[PDB]
Assembly symmetry: D2
């Protein structure tokens, strides 16, 4: 019977930020649902000492309002860790601490409900009402709302040729769940040279002398490339660039986004460099039983005895080769999967030439501007669509759109670079 203004579907950092930023707005009735038991930010792939790769300003609220109660600094103040964090004097939060922080913020918000799987959404055009059915442990529930905000995140990619070997092939995302088993194996092969694979490789490399596994690491990319966090390149993480990229033609958007892996993927440079320093240190007396191979794409898997035969394609020599491995860790990246709850309103969503969800500038995905998208469409808003540092930018625009006024005024120019000439400098 109560009509919500917003239902958030999924509570990752982005919708959690939205809860924190709408909490102070008494005008808005909001509710949020997440299927997990409690907040968890990728803790299956979270070795001790792992950090976010961007500064702590990219918390749930501070880019929109440093005064908000759920800033990371206030969390630190309230948990007797503020002085300690600044003695540590790193801009990068420990991923475990970031988990504790978001858990704390999620726990303060009564309208944020975990153990809540959104299974179905329907729309009543006469009342402009979405009905959201949620499976909760005590049973199914119904809420109605004017606006939806989708924040269902992304999930590991598993190629179809890699399915059906649950005992031997696992995703990087579940690494800590299996590391104990991994340490007893004769051979471990990581596929994918991004940050996930790099952290797993460093973690296994650190312990390689205490066990008897061979440690292989392969990526199809032309090298184990570093993420380019050069500051002039960081200006692309900006309202400036977001707005510029969204204005671009659709094919141009795909080309540009295709060239930008080094802006937000790859390996953190200092981490790259720690891997090398560890290789140097452990090869002092005898060679390390480890192999690293760029330009190699896994394209086949077959069982044989009690190991896998992994077939790769070396793009440089254009040949295929086989390595044997007892376990295969896929660190192949994450992808957006459409939530099944959207199925009955699919005809309410706009789609582009290529059948992807089409976004408006303000992150709505329908003509009525009542369905908004968290972390959807790097092809539409650019490579910072998954960047925690642009989460406040997006939530502020969502909030401003829904309430129809500048609740959180958003910056328009923070970059010294210009990504286009003024309309008056163009030559006919």
């Amino acid at each position: 019977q109560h009509i919500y203004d917003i239902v958030g579907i999924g509570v990752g950092p982005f919708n959690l930020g939205l809860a924190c930023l709408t909490q102070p707005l008494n005008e808005l009735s909001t509710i949020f649902f997440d299927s997990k038991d409690e907040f968890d930010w990728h803790s299956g792939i979270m070795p001790e000492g792992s950090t976010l790769q961007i500064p702590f300003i990219a918390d749930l609220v501070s880019f929109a309002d440093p005064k908000n109660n759920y800033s990371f600094l206030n969390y630190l103040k309230l948990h007797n860790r503020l002085y300690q964090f600044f003695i540590r004097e790193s801009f990068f939060i420990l991923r475990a601490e970031y988990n504790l922080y978001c858990k704390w913020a999620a726990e303060q918000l009564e309208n944020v409900h975990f153990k809540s799987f959104v299974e179905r959404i329907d729309y009543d055009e006469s009342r402009q009402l979405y009905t959201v059915r949620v499976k909760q442990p005590q049973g199914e529930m119904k809420v109605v709302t004017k606006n939806l905000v989708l924040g269902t995140g992304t999930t590991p990619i598993t190629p179809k040729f890699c399915q059906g070997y649950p005992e031997q092939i696992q995703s990087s995302a579940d690494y800590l769940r299996h590391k104990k088993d991994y340490l007893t194996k004769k051979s471990i092969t990581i596929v994918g040279g991004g940050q996930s694979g790099a952290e797993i490789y460093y973690d296994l490399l650190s312990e390689i002398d205490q066990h008897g596994y061979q440690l292989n690491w392969l990526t199809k990319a032309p090298h184990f490339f570093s993420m380019d966090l050069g500051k002039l390149t960081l200006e692309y993480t900006s309202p400036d660039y977001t707005s510029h990229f969204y204005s671009l033609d659709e094919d141009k958007r795909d080309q540009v986004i295709g060239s930008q892996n080094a802006l937000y993927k790859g390996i953190e440079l200092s981490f790259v460099n720690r891997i090398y320093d560890l290789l140097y240190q452990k090869s002092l007396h005898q060679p390390i039983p480890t192999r690293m191979m760029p330009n190699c794409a896994l394209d086949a898997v077959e069982q044989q005895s009690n190991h896998l035969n992994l077939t790769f394609k070396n793009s440089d020599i254009n040949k295929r080769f086989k390595l044997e491995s007892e376990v295969l860790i896929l660190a192949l990246g994450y992808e957006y999967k459409i939530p099944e709850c959207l199925t009955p309103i699919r005809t309410l969503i706009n789609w582009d030439s290529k059948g992807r969800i089409a976004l408006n500038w303000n992150y709505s995905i329908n003509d009525d501007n009542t369905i908004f998208a968290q972390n959807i469409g790097i092809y539409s808003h650019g490579f910072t669509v998954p960047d925690l540092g642009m989460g406040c930018y997006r939530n502020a625009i969502i909030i401003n759109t829904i309430l129809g006024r500048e609740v959180y005024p958003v910056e328009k120019r923070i970059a010294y670079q210009e990504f286009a000439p003024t309309t008056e400098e163009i030559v006919t």
Copy 2:
């Protein structure tokens, strides 16, 4: 006229400015703050381009007490369109010039913070238990009445008596920038004092030594141009833990301890030490640099000559005196607390220690009433972080809590992994 303030702040440096920022939210308290300068100014005469604070930006006016407060540096950054850029810059250290803009911004918002206001005299009325504070402003003298004083008159450059009276030739490092243009035309410049002040002037003048004709001399009495020890295990001394520990030691041990801690808060920022050497290396490539640097050298006498000063130095290593000629002498000998003249009529109401110094209670009051509180007084009583901008919020919280008689701003008790004393039970 008949209005009675809870607090009068005398002086508005960062410490009393922070106190005004942290009390403004408290509508119980009626507070007012007076400063003699034309406007807020934080040592802008010794503020070369690119110069920074030596502690992280968390050490702003309010954030260690309350990260939600409206006058945090991050909120300043947000309201001035510098928040995204500050974090692309990704330094913990605020440009000294930006810290000046930030404080002037805070001061301008607080209508009870009055500059052009010299506090000439303080009297006490034992019948009413009220201080009357006489203030000289451009339009004349005014009187205000208050229950509590908070003394925030800061520190001033040390100019020994033998260096006074040579205005054209001897200047304080505090006024470097007003005299830099004249300096560049001289044939010899001698900087005395090897702290951060002297170092920045040395680097600045060395940086342009090739475009002029000055010999550049730099001498310190310290046993070497030592660096400030900001080792994180030493930073735990910047903490409630250590302030409380130090305060509890006896007076003579406190003088011993503080006399041993020059490296914890004075000396030169390490990376700045290193930039100086690198510049020496770079500029000595083709020919010697006309510069001299001499440790273990104390300025001993100053004799006027024809067109220069004869500077006598005592070298303590060889226990001999020597003379240098210099056209101008830049005094970078450090800063000292001078008891303001307004306090004279109430001196017999203030507590003094066994060495004739103002004595402070744990809560920073200097009388039995606990109605007069001291900002940046008593390095010998609360330790070397008494002038530390990072402990300003801790002191302000305790003052505010004392005056209101409750924990408005609750204060940390242990933040250090180290213990500075065993437990009662472990003592033999």
Copy 3:
């Protein structure tokens, strides 16, 4: 009448290194010629403080033989800079010191002749000897030799449409000759986003407050990207990778080189970050009169009243635009131009399908293996062909080839990575 074993054409760092490495080998008779007045390593684009981008081990000899008299370390020892260089504790030599280093070495070798322009080479098919004709101020030298080593380096790129404007368009290579005029202009435009452009941008941005120029910097690259010097990418600077790249198909070689701009071009990361910090600092009080545009390619210059009209294509928006500018600095990179002296023996040199000089693995470019190439064939030996870190490698192979002996034995594997599988794992 005397028959040399080696004539070196051009004495840049690579042939200078070959002189230093063949000098201890009395079985070789060698001579080198260079047209400049003395050794000069790009001193026209060498702002004070600028450094090499690779560690000092990439000197003239040390990768082949650290004992050699012409190591950088020995240079520093003999010049009372060894202790100082290691207090400075940077791996990167100042460019001005590297110049002094190479000048020092070139001056010790009497068989290294400057003011010597190699004008013509002919080949005696019967005696298997080359006749080299050298123009010198006092006349012409004719020497006979069994082998040639070409080390004529590379030169700045000037597009045809930028030619014919000697007053208003200059190369970045001549920056320091023109800086004084530049500082007087109303507008300065730098085209090219590599290290050359960046250092000029930084150098002019540093002084922008003292003059009245607008400072524009544009590149056609998708961003002002950083050079990827991650240690796992540095492993591509190796015999391992050089041999691997050399073996690849011709078109694969061009594809790979096309994708590797970040391995050896773009901007030094520490240097990109200093640029941003300077922009941050200098915009504190007012906006900087500077513009930076990626994705912009200069494609026309037109003369006007007292300035140039510069038309650019912005590839993101697929439109062209015009800026006005009094001076235009070309920082578009360097290119190999084949020396005129080779014209008579062109028929001796091997060419590939694109009409480029075709190199054998041992860096010879003819079937006799008597003409060797320094810094030719990025399309054949890969992106490290101009890498000072690989000069001793190539020189050892050139020396070993000419003598038919392992005089300087060369490493076959220094990398943890493998760029190809073992022969036995290949799948048919």
Copy 4:
């Protein structure tokens, strides 16, 4: 047997090893070296994986004297296929395990460097002007005669008197790796000493604390866990300039000066201090770490209890003593010079100062004939760099020049920008 040596080196740590490397190309000198250990070993018992030297690699056996020398670390790297790898690693600090292999490799080249050779006794024959050196070897007792002696017997762990006689429970930091496996099974470990040895054991044990059940206690009597000051202006004290300055001072001043300089060559390396804090921060995220760190605490009593030690410390801040229980105690109290027993028969030929210490001449000889030289003796005589590996070549050059009577390895007189004394003409 009757062969008359020019030099007998007693002890072969790095300093006499470098002397062997520097004298080996001088055929005028007949030298022999004896060391009592089974082979060269540089503190391998306190050599955790990844531990490094704290000064740059230029401070190898020979390179400050002669970068061309065959025994340079760079030459070592090249011949062991680690030169390229070392410079990709791009750290100035050699892993202590690698430096160990380097010194082992150098010692293996020198047929005149004999291990398993304890110099038992030294006599002097006035009639022959020869020292007889009696050496205990596995085979028997070897005698050799020699004109000069160079004492290089190093330093040994400090063990207070009240800490002797508890072999199963108290061990030196020097033997940490012999006992680490036992340590990990204990309930309580206590490290006394806050220097680099203490820090490395502390960090090593802290890293593994979660997988075990020890409480980990660390205490130093220093007023904080101070960092070693390696500011480059302080690095200039590691120089011939300062050694000559320090040597020239009077004896009491030398003791005073050396007393003030702990931060210059002791303490903890700054980056290591900061890693310890970062690890403490990381491992306290969920539960408090079972560890204690106490400065200002001097161990002054050990007391056997049943299953553990009662450790009594004096907290000098509060001037009280307290007891901690500990199953094991690790002494990281530093190292001392002990006079070798073999010098006893020639004690009356050695010069002694007014305090009973070995008195050194400027050229490092300790007798009037200038035929007995001292490695790593006389910190009170030649200053804090007497044990500094970066000054080994300087001392060795001066020893070799003295014995040969000419400037064989010329020695720098001034490397420092600073002056530690005025010119004679300036003195009053």
